[PDB]
Amino acid sequence: KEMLAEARARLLNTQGKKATRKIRERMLEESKRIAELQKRRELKQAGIN
RNA sequence: GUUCGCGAAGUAACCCUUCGUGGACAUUUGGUCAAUUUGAAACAAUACAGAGAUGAUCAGCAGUUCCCCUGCAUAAGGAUGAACCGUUUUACAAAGAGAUUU
Secondary structure, eight states, X not given: OXXXXXXXXXXXXXXXXXXXXXXXXXXXXXHHHHHHHHHHHHHHHHTOO
């Protein structure tokens, strides 16, 4: 079970670690961007332009 | 200011000096530029991570670029110098069959 599960973990390893960290970084860009828009929508319902 | 020419005074003085006059010598610099923020250097300070193939640890050389840096450089180095991976629909048809409006 352990060896078969590790084998089907490694056969999924399609993207490289630079592509993995780029998917990670683009996810962080979308999360920071939606947090920035969240903060702006709060300050815009507040009135602070 | 220097010189050349002339006149007038000292002065009935061809010496000298003064005053006045005409000429000549000499003729248009420098600034794309103003002396602390507000016409733009970048590093460093904080905090976190901490490298391209994949199971790990790595040598690289390249390519694209509306990214450059260090380099005297057409050498070399900068993590293989860095970003590359992300979305992803129509030069769009033809034949055949049934179920529908008239």
